[PDB]
CSV table of C-alpha atoms and ligand atoms in Angstrom, one decimal:
chain,number,residue,atom,x,y,z
A,1,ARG,CA,10.9,-18.5,18.2
A,2,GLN,CA,7.6,-18.7,20.1
A,3,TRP,CA,6.6,-15.3,21.7
A,4,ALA,CA,4.5,-13.9,24.5
A,5,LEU,CA,3.2,-10.4,25.4
A,6,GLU,CA,5.4,-10.3,28.5
A,7,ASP,CA,8.4,-9.9,26.3
A,8,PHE,CA,7.4,-6.5,25.1
A,9,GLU,CA,7.1,-3.0,26.6
A,10,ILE,CA,4.3,-1.2,24.9
A,11,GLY,CA,4.5,2.5,23.9
A,12,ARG,CA,2.3,4.9,22.0
A,13,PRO,CA,-0.4,3.8,19.6
A,14,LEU,CA,0.4,4.3,16.0
A,15,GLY,CA,-3.0,3.6,14.5
A,16,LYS,CA,-6.5,2.6,15.7
A,17,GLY,CA,-8.6,0.6,13.3
A,18,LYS,CA,-11.6,-1.7,13.7
A,19,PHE,CA,-9.7,-4.9,13.3
A,20,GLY,CA,-7.4,-3.6,16.1
A,21,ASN,CA,-4.7,-1.1,17.2
A,22,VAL,CA,-1.0,-1.1,16.4
A,23,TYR,CA,1.4,0.2,19.1
A,24,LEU,CA,5.0,1.2,19.3
A,25,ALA,CA,6.8,-1.5,21.3
A,26,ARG,CA,10.2,-2.7,22.5
A,27,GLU,CA,11.3,-6.3,23.0
A,28,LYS,CA,12.7,-6.3,26.6
A,29,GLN,CA,16.0,-8.3,26.0
A,30,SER,CA,17.3,-7.0,22.7
A,31,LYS,CA,15.8,-3.5,23.3
A,32,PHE,CA,14.6,-3.9,19.7
A,33,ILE,CA,12.1,-1.3,18.6
A,34,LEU,CA,9.1,-2.6,16.5
A,35,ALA,CA,5.5,-2.2,15.7
A,36,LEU,CA,3.0,-4.5,17.4
A,37,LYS,CA,-0.4,-5.2,15.7
A,38,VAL,CA,-3.0,-6.3,18.1
A,39,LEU,CA,-6.1,-8.0,16.8
A,40,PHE,CA,-9.2,-9.3,18.6
A,41,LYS,CA,-9.9,-13.0,18.0
A,42,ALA,CA,-13.5,-12.3,18.7
A,43,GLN,CA,-13.7,-9.4,16.4
A,44,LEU,CA,-11.9,-11.5,13.9
A,45,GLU,CA,-14.1,-14.6,14.1
A,46,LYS,CA,-17.3,-12.6,13.9
A,47,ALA,CA,-16.1,-11.3,10.5
A,48,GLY,CA,-14.6,-14.7,9.3
A,49,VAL,CA,-11.4,-12.9,8.2
A,50,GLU,CA,-9.5,-15.6,10.3
A,51,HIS,CA,-8.5,-17.1,7.0
A,52,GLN,CA,-6.5,-14.4,5.0
A,53,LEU,CA,-4.9,-13.2,8.2
A,54,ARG,CA,-3.2,-16.6,8.2
A,55,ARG,CA,-2.5,-16.1,4.5
A,56,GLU,CA,-1.4,-12.4,5.3
A,57,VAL,CA,1.2,-13.8,7.8
A,58,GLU,CA,2.1,-16.8,5.5
A,59,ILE,CA,2.8,-14.4,2.6
A,60,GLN,CA,4.3,-11.4,4.4
A,61,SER,CA,6.7,-13.4,6.7
A,62,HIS,CA,8.3,-14.9,3.5
A,63,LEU,CA,8.9,-11.5,1.7
A,64,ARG,CA,12.3,-9.7,2.3
A,65,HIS,CA,12.7,-6.5,0.5
A,66,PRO,CA,13.8,-3.0,1.6
A,67,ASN,CA,10.7,-1.4,0.2
A,68,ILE,CA,8.3,-4.0,1.9
A,69,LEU,CA,7.5,-3.7,5.5
A,70,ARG,CA,8.8,-6.8,7.3
A,71,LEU,CA,6.9,-9.3,9.4
A,72,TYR,CA,9.1,-10.7,12.2
A,73,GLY,CA,6.5,-13.2,13.4
A,74,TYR,CA,3.4,-13.4,15.5
A,75,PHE,CA,1.7,-15.1,18.5
A,76,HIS,CA,-1.7,-15.2,20.3
A,77,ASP,CA,-2.8,-15.4,23.9
A,78,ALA,CA,-6.2,-16.4,25.3
A,79,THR,CA,-8.1,-13.5,23.8
A,80,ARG,CA,-5.9,-11.7,21.2
A,81,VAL,CA,-3.6,-12.1,18.2
A,82,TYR,CA,-0.4,-10.1,18.1
A,83,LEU,CA,1.6,-9.3,14.9
A,84,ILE,CA,5.2,-8.2,15.3
A,85,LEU,CA,6.1,-5.9,12.5
A,86,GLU,CA,9.0,-3.7,11.4
A,87,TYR,CA,8.6,-0.1,12.7
A,88,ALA,CA,8.6,2.7,10.1
A,89,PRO,CA,10.0,5.8,11.8
A,90,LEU,CA,8.7,8.5,9.4
A,91,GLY,CA,5.0,7.5,9.4
A,92,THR,CA,2.7,7.2,6.4
A,93,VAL,CA,2.7,8.8,3.0
A,94,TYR,CA,-0.9,9.5,3.8
A,95,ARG,CA,0.0,11.9,6.6
A,96,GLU,CA,2.8,13.3,4.5
A,97,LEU,CA,0.2,13.9,1.7
A,98,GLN,CA,-2.2,15.9,3.9
A,99,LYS,CA,0.7,18.0,5.3
A,100,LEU,CA,2.2,18.9,2.0
A,101,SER,CA,-1.1,18.8,0.1
A,102,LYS,CA,0.7,17.6,-3.0
A,103,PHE,CA,4.2,16.2,-4.0
A,104,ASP,CA,6.7,17.5,-6.5
A,105,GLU,CA,7.6,15.4,-9.5
A,106,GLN,CA,10.9,14.5,-7.8
A,107,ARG,CA,9.4,13.0,-4.7
A,108,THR,CA,6.6,11.5,-6.7
A,109,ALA,CA,8.8,9.7,-9.4
A,110,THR,CA,11.0,8.5,-6.6
A,111,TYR,CA,8.1,6.9,-4.7
A,112,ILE,CA,6.9,5.3,-8.0
A,113,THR,CA,10.5,3.8,-8.5
A,114,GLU,CA,10.6,2.4,-5.1
A,115,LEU,CA,7.0,1.1,-5.5
A,116,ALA,CA,7.8,-0.5,-8.9
A,117,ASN,CA,10.8,-2.3,-7.5
A,118,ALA,CA,8.8,-3.6,-4.5
A,119,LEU,CA,6.0,-4.9,-6.9
A,120,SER,CA,8.5,-6.3,-9.4
A,121,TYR,CA,9.8,-8.4,-6.5
A,122,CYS,CA,6.3,-9.2,-5.3
A,123,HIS,CA,5.3,-10.2,-8.8
A,124,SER,CA,8.5,-12.4,-9.2
A,125,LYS,CA,7.1,-14.4,-6.3
A,126,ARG,CA,3.7,-14.1,-7.9
A,127,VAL,CA,2.2,-12.1,-5.0
A,128,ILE,CA,-0.2,-9.2,-5.8
A,129,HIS,CA,-1.0,-6.7,-3.1
A,130,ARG,CA,-4.4,-5.4,-4.4
A,131,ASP,CA,-4.8,-2.8,-1.6
A,132,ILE,CA,-2.1,-0.3,-2.6
A,133,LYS,CA,-3.0,2.9,-1.1
A,134,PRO,CA,-1.2,5.9,0.7
A,135,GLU,CA,-2.4,4.8,4.2
A,136,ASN,CA,-0.6,1.4,3.5
A,137,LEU,CA,2.6,3.2,2.4
A,138,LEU,CA,5.0,3.8,5.2
A,139,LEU,CA,8.4,5.6,5.4
A,140,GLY,CA,11.7,4.4,6.6
A,141,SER,CA,14.5,6.1,8.4
A,142,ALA,CA,15.9,7.5,5.1
A,143,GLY,CA,12.4,8.4,3.9
A,144,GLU,CA,12.3,5.3,1.7
A,145,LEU,CA,8.9,3.9,0.9
A,146,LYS,CA,7.6,0.7,2.6
A,147,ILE,CA,4.6,-1.3,1.4
A,148,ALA,CA,2.9,-2.4,4.6
A,149,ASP,CA,-0.4,-4.4,4.5
A,150,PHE,CA,-1.4,-7.7,3.1
A,151,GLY,CA,-4.6,-8.5,4.8
A,152,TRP,CA,-6.4,-8.5,1.4
A,153,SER,CA,-3.6,-10.0,-0.7
A,154,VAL,CA,-3.4,-13.4,-2.5
A,155,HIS,CA,-1.8,-15.1,-5.4
A,156,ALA,CA,-2.6,-14.6,-9.1
A,157,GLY,CA,-14.8,-1.9,0.4
A,158,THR,CA,-13.2,1.3,-1.0
A,159,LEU,CA,-13.2,1.6,-4.8
A,160,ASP,CA,-10.7,4.5,-5.3
A,161,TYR,CA,-7.5,2.3,-6.0
A,162,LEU,CA,-9.2,-0.7,-7.5
A,163,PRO,CA,-9.1,-1.5,-11.3
A,164,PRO,CA,-12.2,-2.0,-13.6
A,165,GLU,CA,-11.5,-5.6,-13.9
A,166,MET,CA,-11.5,-6.1,-10.1
A,167,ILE,CA,-14.6,-4.0,-9.3
A,168,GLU,CA,-16.5,-5.6,-12.3
A,169,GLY,CA,-15.9,-8.9,-10.6
A,170,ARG,CA,-13.9,-10.3,-13.6
A,171,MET,CA,-10.6,-12.0,-13.8
A,172,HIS,CA,-7.4,-10.2,-12.8
A,173,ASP,CA,-3.6,-10.7,-12.6
A,174,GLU,CA,-0.4,-8.8,-11.8
A,175,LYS,CA,-1.8,-6.0,-14.1
A,176,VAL,CA,-4.1,-4.6,-11.3
A,177,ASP,CA,-1.1,-3.2,-9.5
A,178,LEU,CA,-0.1,-1.3,-12.5
A,179,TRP,CA,-3.4,0.4,-12.4
A,180,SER,CA,-3.0,1.2,-8.8
A,181,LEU,CA,0.5,2.6,-9.5
A,182,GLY,CA,-1.1,5.0,-11.9
A,183,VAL,CA,-3.8,6.0,-9.4
A,184,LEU,CA,-1.1,6.7,-6.9
A,185,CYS,CA,1.0,8.7,-9.4
A,186,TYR,CA,-1.9,10.9,-10.0
A,187,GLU,CA,-2.8,11.3,-6.3
A,188,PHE,CA,0.8,12.1,-5.5
A,189,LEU,CA,0.9,14.9,-8.0
A,190,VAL,CA,-2.7,16.2,-7.6
A,191,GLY,CA,-3.6,15.5,-4.0
A,192,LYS,CA,-6.5,13.3,-4.6
A,193,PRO,CA,-7.4,10.1,-6.6
A,194,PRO,CA,-8.4,10.5,-10.3
A,195,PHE,CA,-11.8,8.8,-9.8
A,196,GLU,CA,-12.8,10.3,-6.5
A,197,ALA,CA,-16.5,11.0,-6.1
A,198,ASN,CA,-18.9,11.5,-3.2
A,199,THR,CA,-20.6,8.1,-3.6
A,200,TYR,CA,-19.4,4.5,-4.0
A,201,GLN,CA,-21.9,4.0,-6.9
A,202,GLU,CA,-20.5,7.1,-8.6
A,203,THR,CA,-16.8,6.2,-8.1
A,204,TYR,CA,-17.8,2.9,-9.6
A,205,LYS,CA,-18.8,4.5,-12.9
A,206,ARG,CA,-15.7,6.7,-13.0
A,207,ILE,CA,-13.5,3.7,-12.7
A,208,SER,CA,-15.6,1.5,-14.9
A,209,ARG,CA,-15.4,4.1,-17.8
A,210,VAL,CA,-11.9,5.4,-16.9
A,211,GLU,CA,-13.0,9.0,-16.4
A,212,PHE,CA,-10.3,11.3,-15.1
A,213,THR,CA,-9.0,14.8,-15.9
A,214,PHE,CA,-5.7,16.6,-15.3
A,215,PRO,CA,-5.4,20.0,-13.6
A,216,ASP,CA,-3.3,22.5,-15.6
A,217,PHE,CA,-0.2,22.0,-13.5
A,218,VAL,CA,0.4,18.3,-14.4
A,219,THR,CA,3.2,18.1,-16.9
A,220,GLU,CA,2.9,16.1,-20.2
A,221,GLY,CA,5.5,13.6,-19.1
A,222,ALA,CA,3.4,12.8,-16.0
A,223,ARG,CA,0.1,12.9,-18.0
A,224,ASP,CA,1.7,10.4,-20.4
A,225,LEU,CA,2.8,7.8,-17.8
A,226,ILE,CA,-0.5,8.1,-15.9
A,227,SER,CA,-2.6,7.7,-19.1
A,228,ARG,CA,-0.6,4.6,-20.0
A,229,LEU,CA,-1.1,3.1,-16.5
A,230,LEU,CA,-4.8,3.9,-16.5
A,231,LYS,CA,-6.0,1.7,-19.2
A,232,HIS,CA,-9.2,-0.3,-19.0
A,233,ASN,CA,-7.7,-3.1,-21.0
A,234,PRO,CA,-5.1,-4.7,-18.6
A,235,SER,CA,-3.0,-6.1,-21.5
A,236,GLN,CA,-2.4,-2.5,-22.7
A,237,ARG,CA,-0.8,-1.5,-19.4
A,238,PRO,CA,3.1,-1.2,-19.4
A,239,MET,CA,5.3,-3.7,-17.7
A,240,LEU,CA,7.1,-2.6,-14.6
A,241,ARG,CA,10.4,-2.3,-16.5
A,242,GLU,CA,8.7,0.1,-19.0
A,243,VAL,CA,7.6,2.2,-16.0
A,244,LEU,CA,11.1,2.2,-14.5
A,245,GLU,CA,12.5,3.5,-17.8
A,246,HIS,CA,9.8,5.9,-18.6
A,247,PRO,CA,11.5,9.4,-19.5
A,248,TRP,CA,9.6,11.2,-16.8
A,249,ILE,CA,10.6,8.7,-14.2
A,250,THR,CA,14.3,8.6,-15.4
A,251,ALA,CA,14.2,12.5,-15.5
A,252,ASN,CA,12.8,13.0,-12.0
A,253,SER,CA,13.6,9.8,-9.9
A,254,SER,CA,16.5,9.2,-7.6
B,1,FH3,C1,-3.9,5.6,9.2
B,1,FH3,C2,-2.6,5.0,9.8
B,1,FH3,O1,-2.3,5.3,10.9
B,1,FH3,N1,-2.0,3.9,9.1
B,1,FH3,C3,-0.9,3.2,9.6
B,1,FH3,C4,-1.0,2.0,10.4
B,1,FH3,C5,-1.1,2.3,11.8
B,1,FH3,C6,0.3,2.1,12.3
B,1,FH3,N2,1.1,1.4,11.3
B,1,FH3,C7,2.5,1.4,11.5
B,1,FH3,C8,3.2,0.2,11.4
B,1,FH3,CL1,2.5,-1.4,11.0
B,1,FH3,C9,4.7,0.3,11.6
B,1,FH3,N3,5.2,1.4,11.9
B,1,FH3,C10,4.6,2.6,12.1
B,1,FH3,N4,5.0,3.9,12.4
B,1,FH3,C11,3.9,4.8,12.3
B,1,FH3,C12,3.9,6.3,12.6
B,1,FH3,C13,2.8,7.1,12.4
B,1,FH3,N5,3.2,8.4,12.7
B,1,FH3,C14,2.4,9.5,12.7
B,1,FH3,N6,4.5,8.3,13.0
B,1,FH3,C15,5.0,7.0,13.0
B,1,FH3,C16,6.4,6.7,13.2
B,1,FH3,N7,2.8,4.0,12.0
B,1,FH3,C17,3.3,2.7,11.8
B,1,FH3,C18,0.1,1.1,10.2
């Protein structure tokens, strides 16, 4: 199905980035509500990201899972490239995080469960996300989690969510998402990433040395899971099944 801009009525902007803006939109005939990502070919070309975008589309349009944001298709005109995406009605976990400041163990463990399932699927098709962060986590009509960017994803910057093996330029596989999963679990419970610093160069040393601390209110069950996920040695990180059956997950998820 080849598309065109004239098929859509454009609504409010949902996000304004440098690559481009994403708007609420409605296809005219079906009256289908969706999200339309508008990128500038010029702004694209001048950065040479024209490659992985094609890889982003190629990968995302093939993935079908309830916890992964769906890509319906795309098209381009004379001057722009448009990405037609599933619309997540409840916004980002990011905004949810800065409203509620922190999450309870129930909401946290539920997000981790949904995330692990989405990743397990992604890993089954040997796709790693690499850029798993709260602003890439969207929420569905039931408040379910939906992973939602793949513009820096491939087959097997901002340091906060990256693993030591990735920042130290080394070799990396599916185990990098397990690290990110731990960073998120911490952030969900605490309100900020475990390795947050005021400089890039300092966040680098925190990650490279695995230097994080727990505030008093983090329970042992959560401290244990996080400590298992945040291992410098990728091989020592738990499999997704082991995360899904962790006592603290089992006790608090839904
Ligand atoms: C920082 C930031 O905005 N990140 C999100 C990107 C922008 C829109 N994106 C969306 C995409 Cl790609 C799809 N659906 C969305 N729904 C929303 C939204 C935001 N609010 C406050 N309420 C709703 C509903 N956003 C999107 C991705």
